[PDB]
Short mmCIF file of C-alpha atoms and ligand atoms in Angstrom, two decimals:
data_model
loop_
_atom_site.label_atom_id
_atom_site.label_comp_id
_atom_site.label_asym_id
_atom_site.label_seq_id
_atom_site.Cartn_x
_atom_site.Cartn_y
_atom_site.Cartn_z
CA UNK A 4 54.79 173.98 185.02
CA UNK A 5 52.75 172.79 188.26
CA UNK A 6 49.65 174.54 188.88
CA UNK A 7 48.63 176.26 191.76
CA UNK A 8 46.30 173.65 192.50
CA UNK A 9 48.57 171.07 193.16
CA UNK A 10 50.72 173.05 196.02
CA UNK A 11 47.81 173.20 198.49
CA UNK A 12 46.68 169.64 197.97
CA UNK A 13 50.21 168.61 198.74
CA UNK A 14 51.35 170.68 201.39
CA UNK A 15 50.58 168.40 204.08
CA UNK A 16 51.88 165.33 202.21
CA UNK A 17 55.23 167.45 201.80
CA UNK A 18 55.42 168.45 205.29
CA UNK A 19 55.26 165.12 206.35
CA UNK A 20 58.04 163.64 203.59
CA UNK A 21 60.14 166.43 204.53
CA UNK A 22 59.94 165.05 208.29
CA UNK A 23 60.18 161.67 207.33
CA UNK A 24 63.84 161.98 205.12
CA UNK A 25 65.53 164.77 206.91
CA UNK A 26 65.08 166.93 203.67
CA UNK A 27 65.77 170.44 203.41
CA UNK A 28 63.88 173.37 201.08
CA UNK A 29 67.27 173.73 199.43
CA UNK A 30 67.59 170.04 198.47
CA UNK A 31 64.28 170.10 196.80
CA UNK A 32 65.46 173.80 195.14
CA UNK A 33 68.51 171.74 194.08
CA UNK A 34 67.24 169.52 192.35
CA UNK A 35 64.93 171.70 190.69
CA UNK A 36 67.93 173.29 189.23
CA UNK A 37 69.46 169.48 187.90
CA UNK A 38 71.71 168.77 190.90
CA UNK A 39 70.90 165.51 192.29
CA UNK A 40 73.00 163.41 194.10
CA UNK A 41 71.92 159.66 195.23
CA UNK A 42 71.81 160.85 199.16
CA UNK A 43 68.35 159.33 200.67
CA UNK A 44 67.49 162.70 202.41
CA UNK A 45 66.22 163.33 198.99
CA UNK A 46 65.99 160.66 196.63
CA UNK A 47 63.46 159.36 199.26
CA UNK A 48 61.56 162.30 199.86
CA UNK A 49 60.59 161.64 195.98
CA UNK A 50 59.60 158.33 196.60
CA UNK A 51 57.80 159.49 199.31
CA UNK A 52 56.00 162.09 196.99
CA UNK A 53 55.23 160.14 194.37
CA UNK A 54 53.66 157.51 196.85
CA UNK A 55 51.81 160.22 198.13
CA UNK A 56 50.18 161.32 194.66
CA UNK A 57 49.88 157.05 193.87
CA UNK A 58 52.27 157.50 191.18
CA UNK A 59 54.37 154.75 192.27
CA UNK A 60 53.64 151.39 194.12
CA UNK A 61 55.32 149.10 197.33
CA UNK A 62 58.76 148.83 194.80
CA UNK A 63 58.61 151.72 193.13
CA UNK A 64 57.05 151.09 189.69
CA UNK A 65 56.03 153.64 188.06
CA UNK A 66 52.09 153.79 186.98
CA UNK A 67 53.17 156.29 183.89
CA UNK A 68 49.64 156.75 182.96
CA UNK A 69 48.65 158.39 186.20
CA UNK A 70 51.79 160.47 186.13
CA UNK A 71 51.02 160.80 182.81
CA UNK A 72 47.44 162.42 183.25
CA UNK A 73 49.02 165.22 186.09
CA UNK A 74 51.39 166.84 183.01
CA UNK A 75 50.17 169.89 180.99
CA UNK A 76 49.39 168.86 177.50
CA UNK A 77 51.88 170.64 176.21
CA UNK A 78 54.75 168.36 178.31
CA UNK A 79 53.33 165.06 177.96
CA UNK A 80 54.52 164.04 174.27
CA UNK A 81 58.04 164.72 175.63
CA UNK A 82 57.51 162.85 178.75
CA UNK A 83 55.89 160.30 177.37
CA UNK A 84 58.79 159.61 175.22
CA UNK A 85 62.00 160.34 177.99
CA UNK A 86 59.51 157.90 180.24
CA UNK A 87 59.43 155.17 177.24
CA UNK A 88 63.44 156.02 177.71
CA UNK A 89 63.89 155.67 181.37
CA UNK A 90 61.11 152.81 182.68
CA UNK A 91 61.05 150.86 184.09
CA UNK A 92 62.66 152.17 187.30
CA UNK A 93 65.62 149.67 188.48
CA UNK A 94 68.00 149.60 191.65
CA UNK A 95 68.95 148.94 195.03
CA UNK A 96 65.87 150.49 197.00
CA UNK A 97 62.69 152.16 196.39
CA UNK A 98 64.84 155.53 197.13
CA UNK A 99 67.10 154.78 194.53
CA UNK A 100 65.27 153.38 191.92
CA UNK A 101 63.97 156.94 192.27
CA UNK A 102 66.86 158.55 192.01
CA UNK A 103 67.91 156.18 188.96
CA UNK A 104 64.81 157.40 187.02
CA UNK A 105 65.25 161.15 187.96
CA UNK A 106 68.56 161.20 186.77
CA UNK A 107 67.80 159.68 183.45
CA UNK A 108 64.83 162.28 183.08
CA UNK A 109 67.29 164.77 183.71
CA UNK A 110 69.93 163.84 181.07
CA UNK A 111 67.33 163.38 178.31
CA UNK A 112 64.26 166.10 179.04
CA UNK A 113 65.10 168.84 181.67
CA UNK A 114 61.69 170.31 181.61
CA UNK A 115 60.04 167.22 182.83
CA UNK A 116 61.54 166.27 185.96
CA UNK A 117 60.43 168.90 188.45
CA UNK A 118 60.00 168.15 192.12
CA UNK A 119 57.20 169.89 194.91
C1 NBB B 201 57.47 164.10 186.80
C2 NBB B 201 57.95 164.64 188.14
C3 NBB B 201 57.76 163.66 189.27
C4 NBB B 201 58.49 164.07 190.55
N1 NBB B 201 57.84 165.28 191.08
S1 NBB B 201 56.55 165.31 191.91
O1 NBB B 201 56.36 164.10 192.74
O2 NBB B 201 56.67 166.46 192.84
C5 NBB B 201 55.29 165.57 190.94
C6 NBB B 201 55.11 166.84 190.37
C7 NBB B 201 54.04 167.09 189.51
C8 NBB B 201 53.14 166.08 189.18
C9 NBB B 201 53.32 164.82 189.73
C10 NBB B 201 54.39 164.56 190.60
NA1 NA B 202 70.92 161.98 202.97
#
């Protein structure tokens, strides 16, 4: 459901998350298909993202309003209720407290969780 708009705002801040994690196109297209696995080469390159868009802060909380506000109208009911569901984040790092949360989007509302 992202807009166009989005991919050229992000682009450098994807390059650079990429580089960061050691992620690969086909993790991210992975993902995007519901396979996630808690293996930092991607669950921080989400982090990474969503610190990147100020979505989430130093530990990983999530500012759901923000995120919120980037949804079409159409998704946000939803999300707003698997978010009421799934925050706030928990575990061991920022990377997996990301992984925690996308893994609980994914088993409750599998058009929400959707990663640039
Ligand atoms: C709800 C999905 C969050 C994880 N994906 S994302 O960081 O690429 C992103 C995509 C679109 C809007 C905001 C963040
Ligand atoms: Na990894």
């Amino acid at each position: 459901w992202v807009p166009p708009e989005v991919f050229d705002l992000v682009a450098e801040d994807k390059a650079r998350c990429m580089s960061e994690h050691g992620t690969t196109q086909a993790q991210i297209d992975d993902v995007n298909k519901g396979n996630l696995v808690n293996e930092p080469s991607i669950t921080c390159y989400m982090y990474c993202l969503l610190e990147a868009f100020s979505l989430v802060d130093d530990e990983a909380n999530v500012d759901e309003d923000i995120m919120l506000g980037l949804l079409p109208d159409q998704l946000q009911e939803r999300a707003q209720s698997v978010m009421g569901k799934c925050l706030p984040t928990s575990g061991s790092d920022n990377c997996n407290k990301i992984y925690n949360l996308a893994k609980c989007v994914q088993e409750s509302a599998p058009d929400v969780w959707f990663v640039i």
